[PDB]
Amino acid sequence: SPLPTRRTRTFSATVRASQGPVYKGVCKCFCRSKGHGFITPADGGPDIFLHISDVEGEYVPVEGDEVTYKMCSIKNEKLQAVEVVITHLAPGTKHETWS
Amino acid sequence: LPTRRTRTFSATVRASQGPVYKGVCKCFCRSKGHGFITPADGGPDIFLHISDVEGEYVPVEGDEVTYKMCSIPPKNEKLQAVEVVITHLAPGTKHETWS
Amino acid sequence: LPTRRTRTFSATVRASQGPVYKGVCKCFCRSKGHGFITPADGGPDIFLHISDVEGEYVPVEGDEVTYKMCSIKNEKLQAVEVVITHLAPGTKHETWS
Amino acid sequence: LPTRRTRTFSATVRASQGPVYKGVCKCFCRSKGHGFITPADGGPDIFLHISDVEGEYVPVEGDEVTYKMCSIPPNEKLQAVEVVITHLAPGTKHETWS
């Protein structure tokens, strides 16, 4: 897919997203050097695509990290997460900040 | 003075969990990377950093915005706008994109 | 000596709007109406005034706590919106009455 | 009836643990030590005891506020705790305790 960054979300796309509900989920995947990953919804579902630009906080996300996010459709059905916050850090792994 | 990938784990957390406010962009210099939002309901203006702004448009004086609030540790001496969305375009200035 | 009905408008908003820290009640003399909290994560102790304590229990050395912070007119730190999360095992705990 | 000194240990934790809401001071009578907050989302006015107010100002109708929520035990009825005046109501005069 043409990568839907946060500096790229259309005006309305962004406003609609921000007005939706807040979801809980877990970080399944994330490659810092690629700029993306996925998030396994809580309340079960297809994994939501995750772009590095939509991430919030000093920390780089890691598999098993708990997250809250809003959804934003991409121009088909695919789903993206926006306004993404790490709620719980996964114990055991090393957690790293950007920089 | 802090940015998105700089904002401590929990500041990010508690901000995201707070209420949403409406304001108006009062300042913003892209060269410099910050501006100010005067809250609707008047009062003190809130500091605003470019990395905390979502969507494709660059904020401009007069833009309506929803945002969340959050303070600047360890001392919480000043407030800051986070999760900041342009909701209504300042009707008279012509607008650009980060591109 | 800032207290809750004395904290200025901006300080209150600004504290209420910062992170939530964990710590431990280092001491508390009720008759004096204050004490200290020690930050979890190490750091300088935090002034703790009685008016900022929320709940039926008087605080005791060892009580686990959460709080918001607020620099005091340069800066000392005060703890605000202060919650006892676990009671101190050794000691006996009183109520405010 | 419950106050910030009367609030059970347990109640206090959950209250603080829960979400933060926005609202507006519906009323408040300092003489009586209580008023109401109209929730912004929408819904029933939240009871508000004086003890739970932080800051130097006595609350005024139209003051805009954040707060966490609490339930009054036998529950049902709700209450507001950790109550911050985020925005001063512009029209009237604003006072302070004392």
Curated annotation (Swiss-Prot), chain A:
GO molecular function, one term: mRNA 3'-UTR binding
Phosphoprotein in keyword set: yes
Main subcellular localisation: cytoplasm
Location of this chain's protein in the cell: Cytoplasm; Cytoplasm, P-body; Cytoplasmic granule
Keyword annotations from UniProtKB, A to Z: Acetylation, Cytoplasm, Phosphoprotein, RNA-binding
Annotated Gene Ontology cellular component terms: cytoplasm; cytoplasmic exosome (RNase complex); cytosol; P granule; P-body
Domain of life per record: Eukaryota
Modified residue annotations for Phosphoserine: 1, 12, 18
Keyword match Mitochondrion: no
Modified sites of kind Phosphothreonine: 5
GO aspect biological process, one term: intracellular signal transduction
CSD domain boundaries: 22-87
Post-translational modification: Dephosphorylated by calcineurin in a Ca(2+) dependent manner. Can be phosphorylated by DYRK2 (in vitro).
Subunit structure: Homodimer. Interacts with STYX.
Function of the protein: Binds mRNA and regulates the stability of target mRNA. Binds single-stranded DNA (in vitro).
Protein name per UniProt: Calcium-regulated heat-stable protein 1
Species: Homo sapiens
Part of the whole protein covered: 41 to 141 of 147
From Swiss-Prot, chain B:
PTM notes: Dephosphorylated by calcineurin in a Ca(2+) dependent manner. Can be phosphorylated by DYRK2 (in vitro).
GO MF terms, alphabetically ordered: mRNA 3'-UTR binding; phosphatase binding
Interval of the full protein contained in this chain: 43 to 141 of 147
Source species of the chain: Homo sapiens (Human)
GO biological-process terms attached to the record: intracellular signal transduction; regulation of mRNA stability
Cellular component terms (Gene Ontology): cytoplasm; cytoplasmic exosome (RNase complex); cytosol; P granule; P-body
Major location category of this protein: cytoplasm
Subcellular location: Cytoplasm; Cytoplasm, P-body; Cytoplasmic granule
Modified residues annotated as Phosphoserine in this record: 10, 16
Name of the protein in question: Calcium-regulated heat-stable protein 1
Disulfide bonds: none
Main function: Binds mRNA and regulates the stability of target mRNA. Binds single-stranded DNA (in vitro).
Positions of modified residues (Phosphothreonine): 3
Quaternary state and interactors: Homodimer. Interacts with STYX.
Residue ranges constituting the CSD domain according to the UniProt record: 20-87
Species lineage: Eukaryota, Metazoa, Chordata, Craniata, Vertebrata
Entry superkingdom: Eukaryota
Assigned keywords, A-Z: Acetylation, Cytoplasm, Phosphoprotein, RNA-binding
Coiled coil: none
